[PDB]
Amino acid sequence: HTSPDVDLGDISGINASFVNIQKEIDRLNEVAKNLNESLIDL
Amino acid sequence: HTSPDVDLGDISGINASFVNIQKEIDRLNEVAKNLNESLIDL
Amino acid sequence: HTSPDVDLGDISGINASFVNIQKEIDRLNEVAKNLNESLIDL
Amino acid sequence: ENQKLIANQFNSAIGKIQDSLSSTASALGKLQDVVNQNAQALNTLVKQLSSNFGAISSVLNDILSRLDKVE
Amino acid sequence: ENQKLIANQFNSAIGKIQDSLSSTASALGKLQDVVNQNAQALNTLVKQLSSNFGAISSVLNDILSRLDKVE
Amino acid sequence: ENQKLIANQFNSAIGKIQDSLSSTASALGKLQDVVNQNAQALNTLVKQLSSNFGAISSVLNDILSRLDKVE
C-alpha cells in the first residue's frame, strides 16, 4: 500500500505590476506653474 | 497520543483601497464647459 | 457510519474588469499634434 | 486683420483644449470605475478566501481528531 | 508690438499645453497598462485558486472516504 | 480695446487651464497611489496564499502518511 503525494498548483509567479507616472505628474504641475509666465501684460 | 492544531495564516487584513477622484473629474468637465466663456468675440 | 461531503465556496465568479481608454489617449495625442495648427503666424 | 487671426487661432485652440479636457475627464472616470471594481473584486476574493480557509481549517481539524481517535 | 506680445505669449502657452497633453496621454497609457496587467493577474490568481481548491476538495473527499472505511 | 479683450480672455483661459492641469495632476496622483496600493495588496495576498497552501500541502501529506500507516 502507498499514498500519492499532493502537489498544489504553485501560484507564486502571479505578480502585480506597479505604476510610476511621477515624472508626468511633476511635469503637469510644472506646466501649471509655468503658465503664469505666459500671461499677457500689455 | 495527541494531534497539533493547524492554524492557517489569516489573510483578512489584506484590503484593497478605493479611489475617489470625482471632484477632479467634475472640475475638468466644469472647466471644459467654462472655457466657452473665454472665447473672443471681437 | 457516513461522511459528509465538503463543498468549498466557489470563487470563480470573481472577475476583474479591464479598462479601455485608448480612444481618449489617441484623442489627447491627436490634439497635442493639432495644436500646432493653432499657432499664430502674424 | 491680425486681431481677427489672433482671435480665430485662440478660439480654435480653446476648442481643441476643451476636447482634450473632456477626453481626460472620460479617461479618468473610466480608470476610476475599473480601479474601484478591481478593488471590490480583490476584497470579495479575500473574504471568500478567508471563509474557504476557515472551512478547510475546520475540516482538517476534525480529520486530525479522527486520526487521533484511530491511533 | 502688442500684437507680437500676444502672439508670442499665445505660442508659448500652446507649446506648454502641448507638453501637458503629451504628459497626460503618457500617464493615462501607463495607468491603463498597469491596471490591465493587475486585472489579468487577479483573473489568473482566481483561476489557479479555483483549480487548487478543486484539488483540495477532491483530496479531502478521498481522505474522508478513507476515514469512513476505517471507522 | 480689442487687444485688452484678447489679453483678458487669454488670461482667463490660461487660469482655467492651470486649474484643469492641477486637477489632472491630483487625479493622476491619487490613481497612482491607489493602483500601487492594490498591487501591493495583491502581492501580499499571493505571498500569504503561497504560505497557506504550503502549510495545507504539508498537513495533508502528513495525514496521507498517517492513513497509509493505518491501512
Which residues in chain E have their CB less than 8 angstroms from residue C34's CB?
none
Q: Could D25 and B32 be called an inter-chain contact, meaning their C-beta atoms sit closer than 8 Å?
A: yes
Give dist(CA C12, CA E48) in Å, integer: 10
A33: Cβ contacts below 8 Å, ≥ 6 apart: none
Domain count within chain A? 1
Nearest to C18 among E18, E36, E46 (CB): E36
CA atoms within 13 A on the CB side of E21: 29
Q: Which residues contact E25 (CB under 8 A, 6 or more apart)?
A: C25, C28, C29, C32
SS3 sequence of F38-49 = HHHHHHHHHHHH
E runs forming strands in chain E? none
DSSP secondary structure code for residue A12 in this structure? T
Determine the Cα–Cα distance for residues F29 and E27; give it in Å rounded to an integer.
Answer: 10
Q: What angle do CA C31, C33, C38 make, to 5 degrees?
A: 80
- Contact list in B for residue D46 (CB cut-off 8 A) is 11-12, 14-16
Residue C22: alpha-carbon gap to chain centroid: 9
Q: Which residue has the cell 470625482?
A: B22
C-alpha cell at D21: 479636457
Euclidean distance between CA atoms E25 and B40, whole angstroms: 28
Amino acid letter, B4: P
Judged on CB neighbours under 10 Å (0-12, 13-18, 19+), C37 is: exposed
Four-residue CA torsion sign, A29, D13, B34, B40 = positive
Whether F34 and D35 have beta carbons less than 8 Å apart is answered as yes
Measured distance CA(D29)–CA(D35) in Å, rounded = 10
Strand boundaries in chain A, DSSP class E: none
Contacts of B4 (CB under 8 A, 6+ apart): D64
Task: Tell me the C-alpha distance between B29 and B26, whole Å.
Answer: 5
Spatial separation of the C-alpha atoms in residues A10 and F49, rounded to whole Å: 10
- Number of helices and strands in chain B (H, E): 1, 0
Q: Which residue of A has its CA nearest to F39?
A: A16
The answer to whether E68 touches D66, Cβ cutoff 8 Å, is: no
| Alpha helix segments (H runs only) across E1-71 | 2-70
Neighbours of chain C (3+ CB pairs under 8 A): D, E
Q: Which domain holds residue A30?
A: 1-42
The Cβ of residue F41 has, within 10 Å, a number of other Cβ atoms equal to: 21
D30 CB near a chain C CB, below 8 Å?
yes
Contact in structure between B8 and D56 (CB atoms under 8 Å):
yes
Residue B14's identity, in one-letter code, is I
